[PDB]
Design a protein around this ligand. Structure first.
Ligand SMILES: Nc1nc2c(ncn2[C@@H]2O[C@H](COP(=O)(O)O)[C@@H](O)[C@H]2O)c(=O)[nH]1
Ligand SMILES: Nc1nc2c(ncn2[C@@H]2O[C@H](COP(=O)(O)O)[C@@H](O)[C@H]2O)c(=O)[nH]1
Ligand SMILES: Nc1nc2c(ncn2[C@@H]2O[C@H](COP(=O)(O)O)[C@@H](O)[C@H]2O)c(=O)[nH]1
Ligand SMILES: Nc1nc2c(ncn2[C@@H]2O[C@H](COP(=O)(O)O)[C@@H](O)[C@H]2O)c(=O)[nH]1
Lengths: 319, 305
């Protein structure tokens, strides 16, 4: 039951230690009837200066700050994430590859700028209220924690989200879509990578389509509508639709080759866990799973119109 | 769900501190041996909580634990489980400086900076002696040592295993130095319910302690090595805290019943003893030579028949 907080970088150990630390302290804090306004300006801060002690994995000296912990605890709850699960995902083993995933691929940890952290505060009261009135049903990023780590006098800002992708199903192709009239494509650099991040004209040029079926398309499009309208209400623009594609047969084969090396359920998922996943329509050219979520809402044409434009595009991404 | 609700913020910080450090230690491997650095080591944490978790805790505070690996090892060598130690401190506010945990198992004494220095001074040798005697000793048993910073004020604390029983009411206590001077209770002191008597008011009482010549064997075999250890360390002016539980009295879950592994210092009255009693006996207040050692030793050998 010993947790060592062992990691490739001291930053990771401190991250593991702080999530572990704060989740445990929160376990000693009654769950409130409601969130008070201060909760939105609140934060916790701990500074550690150990001497000749417990220095194998943690640095002797570091700081950890959690923004607005009462609010994020509540967000986790409304997103149906149990605090102990969250803690275990982060601390049972070092997050792996600034962009990390928890070792079990449930949670994504992004290193952000100070400005990003500033925007979360700005948007936080309304985002919460919006998560309340849409019952956690949303294509928006789902925020679970915000933290500032300090190691060797250096401050690092981090935001934890639920993975847009499945924690279990492989992605075989992703796109970052915006719907911009501007040319959007992948550099020769990108296309050369393993899992390139294709863009608008790649999607349009490939003739790609996402066969989800009318009932999913409608539910999807109703989410997209209020999400982008909510974002337009704030001063927010230039976010993307992150699209991941999972080829069910290709995976079955990949798995089969995986076991072969040892010797020598099929494209389904828990919609409560892989929250952005959608099956293909029974009459799809091939058996697929899609993951679709709005990306990057923190960091001519104005907002209101973007939501209008962004919206028309994603409505045409599918059938 | 522990709130750390207490009469006083210092106590809340203490409860929070022991909780925090014991949890942290449960993530630290038990080593194959203590190292010299473990005797100069510490943990420090500073807390700054804006608009968060203020119901019982101050928003800002510090908690420092001295030599946490050595005290964790001492706990084990005394047969104390970390989880219990933690539970005794945090389950409920320690009560009435001189506190005990809510279950009276552990004593919490405010002490001075010089005290904390003195402890660092004797600690390696004290530990070594605890090892060599397999935890069996009338010396105080030190379970942890802490410094608290609250409202800008630093406070030092040492935790010991309670000398008296955690259940058995003590009816009379004597502080015994074996001195050749005038040590008696003061008129005002002689007033309150729990009078701290001394040598003279004891030797002039004809009071003996009946444990047998057998328990006197164990006890005196113990006391000698202890006062010896203190001498070699050139320490003195320490007392023998003695407690007396009158069975019949309390009677007016059984009378005189107790768990020897928890009430480590308690001794049953002998069979042939006049009244039915339980005695509690340990050395106290040694944070500070031969003559005192041998003088002390004899005045104590003269109360066990
Ligand atoms: N709106 C808002 N912004 C904050 C708050 N706390 C910190 N920030 C912003 O977050 C960034 C980093 O804050 P730090 O916690 O490093 O002081 C800064 O850009 C800071 O202005 C807050 O309570 N409200
Ligand atoms: N650190 C910190 N930064 C804040 C706080 N409240 C607001 N800010 C910062 O204040 C700025 C707002 O300033 P304005 O642009 O309205 O003059 C934001 O960029 C954000 O960085 C706070 O409580 N703490
Ligand atoms: N597994 C996973 N990858 C992501 C997620 N969000 C973005 N990525 C990927 O990470 C890369 C950079 O992230 P971004 O700049 O959007 O933060 C992109 O190639 C994108 O496909 C996510 O939620 N989960
Ligand atoms: N000998 C010794 N004394 C210490 C050590 N740590 C703290 N002390 C002493 O204990 C007292 C309290 O120290 P503070 O922890 O308040 O800085 C001071 O007299 C200090 O010098 C140590 O590692 N060794």
């Amino acid at each position: 039951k010993v947790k060592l907080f062992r990691a490739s970088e001291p930053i990771l150990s401190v991250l593991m230690w702080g999530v572990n630390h704060t989740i445990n302290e929160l376990s000693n804090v009654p769950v409130p009837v409601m969130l008070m306004p201060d909760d939105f300006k609140a934060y916790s801060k701990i500074k550690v200066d150990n001497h000749l002690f417990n220095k194998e994995n943690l640095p002797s000296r570091f700081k950890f700050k959690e923004y607005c912990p009462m609010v994020f605890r509540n967000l986790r709850e409304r997103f149906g994430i149990d605090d102990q699960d969250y803690q275990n995902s982060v601390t049972r083993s070092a997050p792996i590859n600034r962009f990390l995933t928890t070792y079990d691929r449930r949670f994504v940890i992004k290193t952000v700028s100070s400005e990003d952290v500033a925007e979360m505060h700005n948007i936080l009261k309304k985002y919460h209220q919006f998560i309340v009135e849409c019952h956690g049903n949303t294509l928006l990023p789902q925020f679970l924690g915000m933290y500032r780590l300090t190691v060797d006098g250096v401050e690092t800002y981090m935001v934890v989200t639920r993975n847009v992708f499945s924690h279990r199903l492989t992605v075989h192709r992703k796109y970052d879509l915006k719907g911009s009239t501007v040319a959007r494509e992948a550099s020769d650099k990108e296309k050369a990578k393993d899992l390139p991040t294709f863009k608008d004209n790649d999607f349009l040029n490939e003739g790609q389509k996402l066969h989800v079926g009318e009932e999913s398309k409608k539910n999807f499009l109703e989410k997209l509508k209020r999400d982008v309208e909510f974002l337009a209400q704030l001063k927010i623009m230039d976010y993307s639709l992150l699209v991941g594609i999972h080829d069910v047969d290709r995976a079955e084969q990949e798995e089969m080759e995986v076991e072969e090396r040892a010797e020598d359920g099929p494209g389904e998922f828990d919609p409560s866990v892989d929250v952005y996943a959608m099956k293909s329509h029974e009459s799809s050219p091939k058996k697929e799973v899609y993951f679709m979520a709005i990306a990057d809402i923190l960091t001519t044409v104005n907002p209101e119109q973007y939501s209008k434009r962004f919206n028309e595009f994603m409505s045409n991404i599918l059938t």
